[PDB]
Amino acid sequence: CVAYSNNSIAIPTNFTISVTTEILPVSMTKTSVDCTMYLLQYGSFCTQLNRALTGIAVEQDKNTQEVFAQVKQIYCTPPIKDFGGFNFSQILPDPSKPSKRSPIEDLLFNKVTLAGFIKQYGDCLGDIAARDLICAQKFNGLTVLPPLLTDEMIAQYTSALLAGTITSGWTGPALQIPFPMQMAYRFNGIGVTQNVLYENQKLIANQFNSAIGKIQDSLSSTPSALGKLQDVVNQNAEALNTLVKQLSSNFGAIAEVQIDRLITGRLQSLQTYVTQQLIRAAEIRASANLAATKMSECVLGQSKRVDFCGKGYHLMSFPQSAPHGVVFLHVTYVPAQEKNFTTAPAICHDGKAHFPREGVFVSNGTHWFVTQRNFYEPQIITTDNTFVSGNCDVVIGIVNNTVYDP
Amino acid sequence: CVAYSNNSIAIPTNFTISVTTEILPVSMTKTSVDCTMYLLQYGSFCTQLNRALTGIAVEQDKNTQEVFAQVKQIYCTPPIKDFGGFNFSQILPDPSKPSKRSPIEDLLFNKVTLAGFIKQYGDCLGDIAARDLICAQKFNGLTVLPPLLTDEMIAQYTSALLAGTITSGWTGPALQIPFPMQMAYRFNGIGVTQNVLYENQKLIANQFNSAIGKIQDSLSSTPSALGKLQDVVNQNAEALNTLVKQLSSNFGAIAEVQIDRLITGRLQSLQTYVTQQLIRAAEIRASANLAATKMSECVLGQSKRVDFCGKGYHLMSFPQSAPHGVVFLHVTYVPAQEKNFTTAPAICHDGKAHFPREGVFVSNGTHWFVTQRNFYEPQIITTDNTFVSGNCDVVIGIVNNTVYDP
Amino acid sequence: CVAYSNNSIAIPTNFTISVTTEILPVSMTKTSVDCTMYLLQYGSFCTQLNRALTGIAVEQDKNTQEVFAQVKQIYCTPPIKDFGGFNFSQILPDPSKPSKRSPIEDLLFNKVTLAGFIKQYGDCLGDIAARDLICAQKFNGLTVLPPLLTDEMIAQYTSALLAGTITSGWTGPALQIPFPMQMAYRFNGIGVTQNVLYENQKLIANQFNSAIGKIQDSLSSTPSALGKLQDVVNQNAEALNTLVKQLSSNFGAIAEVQIDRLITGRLQSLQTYVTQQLIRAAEIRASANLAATKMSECVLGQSKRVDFCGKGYHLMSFPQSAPHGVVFLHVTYVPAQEKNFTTAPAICHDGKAHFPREGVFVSNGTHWFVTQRNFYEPQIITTDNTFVSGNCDVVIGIVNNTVYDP
């Protein structure tokens, strides 16, 4: 417990900068059915379920656009990966490997990965020798469709977001600035004056480099973080396998009457598949909108609310791509070594009451100082860090101390 | 009407601090039915309505958590109830009465209170000698279930919120500070400099004490405010009585055919009850979310929007518990004695144009001053409350006045 | 592309003020049917569709209130239309024409205007000699009902909003101020110091007058902007004509059996009309809520988000009425002539590190200055625009330059 005090104030004298990951899926496997295998205005039965599959397939492109296609203007490649001591080598993409993903992005696409249909349709669809129709024939009607924005296009949106978050700050307003100077403005957004960063820059950079190194150390070796994306791929691949099991094994299970039971059994199996696809879309839409609002709040700016864009007070955020999802590298500030100091509302000198121009009056026991409330940086009391108004008699809790005029 | 002026500005020279109540219900009576009185995978008829009763019963715990369980960290008991002259004796709980509710909270639980089922099931459920099953037998199937968070647990959440709002300010950022100093920051959040509070502290405290006294004076003697909570308890107790009337009197009203009309009549009566319970939940969910967002906006911080967290410009807010609801004690600031003063954009001296470092230039008719725009606190024009830029010729509306250098 | 730099910062040295239009429909034609032509507790068939028509008719009054009836307090007529050089003659209403609409509002009601039922029912309803019932008889049952707030009442709400946005600023807080001084506060809200406006006031006013003149020049001559309101009137008038075509021509198309096909055909035609009226309400509700939130964000204040209240950084907004809609005259600021200057974190003098009290250190190549980051307004480095803390050794990127003490 931290209890009352009419005499004291708590101020932190240390801090630490932490980088933490948040994993959010935004997309889902776009499934479509060619009902001719199940001027063609409409079939009566298979069309009603396939129009819904088309509806959610368009929603996946809508979700991916709403999370990644939030900005377009190109900040050109950074590309040096040093930025005043902050090691961004884990985060910027390189042409040294022709995929041009970041080293962390490559790990996301390694751990989140695929006797199943998402495998079999791809093994069927050779970029040449195969087409949509020939494999809708070779495999009875079920298809997975191309994404509007592929992994590399999503990676280019991530690259532009990274360059725009490092070379400048997304709002305010917004114009290009050096990086440690930008984080000094992030400090001023927290409530800590800018000078606190420039004089701790190597320590802040070392804390950042340690946290960013342990992120990549954790992703592969401690896999318990990547589960949220393993689910969306595996459980939908399972959905396609469970459908095809009933559509392939139940050919020798379940004339006109026997046929009208078997085919309607296939339609009942399709209804079983479609209804849970439409239910999985309820999670994907919610998590995609969460990723979109955290893109606007954490990456495209600096958030006012706490524990939303990572734990602690928000500093900034960086995006990284993943199969059907995005990872937010939330950089946050948290104070440490809080300590109680005796405080006063005003300082009395020569019969006049002085108030801090910004900050608080605090004492080490023997002398009084003026200090910013959000970090212990004490200063002598002067005529240019205080302002005068009123009398030493009208104030409750006023205390006597000398005030200097340099 | 207040009309145009290119020459003048309106500034208030007085203010008053008001405390006002907002009453919001957040919970509803959790009803459940044991269908055996109406490996047991499912009954066909009574199960479908009882699963919905279970669904809204879980929603009541969800609503109560969303409004009260918004924070957990304990600020220990205050417990002195003086805080620089502001009398919080009406608001803090005491162990002098073993319920440990606040004196106002005890009045809320007095006026909002209960030949009816919410009474009869409780008179049936003795803490010993009775159980759930024996009274589901003694009274045909209808039950009201325990809340996840009882009145005392809700009171402990209120106690922690009060201690966290008095001992510190919930964001920014957030750390413990003396109370009148915290309200000085609330003044600076309004737009009035902090010194205006410390020199009016006894007057502000007296206004607060008068308003907080009239709140408790009003609740019991002028009951027209408590109606919003009387409704949610009485109209749901009426719903249970109206159900049981048809389930008990219509035993001698409405063989296999006569039975299949009577029992389905009981199910039709249950549908009548369940559908309006699910409609009452529409009000309870909306008001609980309103209480949750006003907990985050009014209690867990200071609101930027006006007339939301009480009438006038928002200062702070304090929670108090009530049967199935929460009361917000909105403390707000409103300016008074607005007055028009002649104003100028810049002051010309020695051929240079000076602008106020913050505030406006105003004149009493004979001399020019610099003043904060949000409260009339005039000051002499100096070189440290103005900044220089430009010429006396390029400015429209510029005026001549001396500027001093102390 | 704009690429990296650890050494430089981009600052704009020019700007331009633009006025742009956003058009939003908020209302829809309130249709009602007297089912006696198609103690009267209910008819079975026509009542179910007419209760829905009543439901959306009440929603149109709700939408119009939510967008226009957001404030009530009267700022009296301005009425001079000069406001420091900004020509508001296009925007304020005049009694020189007895409608008392603004010259732009009169153009909105000219271009958005009406062998059709919205015409025929009005030609039927003479203010005298006709009534609701006699024309529900002369034309079989279909009616369009009066709006709760007419065009002139909506115009009075617009007039009060204009007076409240010009004579004062709607929050903060809010009190009456001269107009160019208010826009100086709008500049400070953008991030540009107030003095930048007063010394460019004639240029800013000329840019405003040119944009506001081209708005009215565009509306009538280049009609491609007014289409969003042409649709909501014409396509609903078409809906009433398409209904009446089936209700009037199909009297000689489609005894008890032939009657029970014909009348149900009229009900099927009514279902065709009602379902698309309820679908058009989905657009009208969304656009009305967009107009309501942009009334609160753009007119009743100044928006923090970009490209929402017009393109560029938001300055202010003015409302104008239109048939079933509102037009927002978004005034926005956008910087121009961005230029790169060499920058430094701190300035070293006499062994002490100095930081800018607000702004950045920049150099013309030969000398160092301090400047606000959001507009190029350079200043000499002094002891009253910098503050001292730390040493010249602990800072990365520090540079040497003299600092003056006036």
Author numbering:
A (entry chain A), B (entry chain A), C (entry chain A): 704 to 741, 753 to 828, 831 to 887, 891 to 973, 989 to 1140
From the paper:
The S protein is composed of the S1 subunit, which mediates attachment, and the S2 subunit, which fuses the viral and host cell membranes. Similar to influenza hemagglutinin (HA), the fusogenic S2 subunit is metastable and will refold in the absence of the fusion-suppressive S1 domains as it transitions to an elongated, stable postfusion conformation. Here, we rationally engineer the sequence-conserved S2 subunit of the SARS-CoV-2 spike protein and characterize the resulting S2-only antigens. Structural studies demonstrate that the introduction of interprotomer disulfide bonds can lock S2 in prefusion trimers, although the apex samples a continuum of conformations between open and closed states.
We first generated a base construct for S2-only antigens (HexaPro-S2) by removing the entire S1 subunit from the HexaPro S protein (containing 6 stabilizing proline substitutions) and deleting a flexible region (residues 686–696) from the N-terminus of the S2 subunit. We further constructed a version of the S704C/K790C S2 antigen without the stem helix and remaining ectodomain stalk (residues 1142–1208), named Δstalk, which also expressed robustly and eluted as a monodisperse peak on SEC. We renamed it HexaPro-SS (stabilized stem) and added the same modifications at the C-terminus of S2, generating HexaPro-SS-PentaStalks and HexaPro-SS-Δstalk. To investigate whether our design effectively locked the S2-only antigen in the prefusion conformation, we determined the crystal structure of HexaPro-SS-Δstalk. The protein complex crystallized in space group R3 and an X-ray diffraction dataset was collected to a resolution of 3.2 Å. The asymmetric unit contained two S2 protomers (each from a different trimer), packed in a head-to-head arrangement, resulting in the upper half of the central helices packing against each other. HexaPro-SS-Δstalk adopted a prefusion conformation and formed a trimer when crystallographic symmetry was applied. The cysteine substitutions (Cys704/Cys790) from symmetry mates are in proximity to each other to form disulfide bonds, but Glu957 could not form a salt bridge with Arg765 from the neighboring protomer due to separation of the protomers at the apex. Although the low resolution of these 3D reconstructions prevented us from building atomic models, all three conformations are prefusion trimers, consistent with our crystallographic data. Taken together, the HexaPro-SS-Δstalk S2-only antigen presents multiple prefusion conformations that differ in the extent to which the apex is open. Among all S2 constructs, HexaPro-SS-Δstalk elicited inferior protection than others against SARS-CoV-2 and SARS-CoV challenges, indicating that stem-helix epitopes are important for favorable vaccine responses.
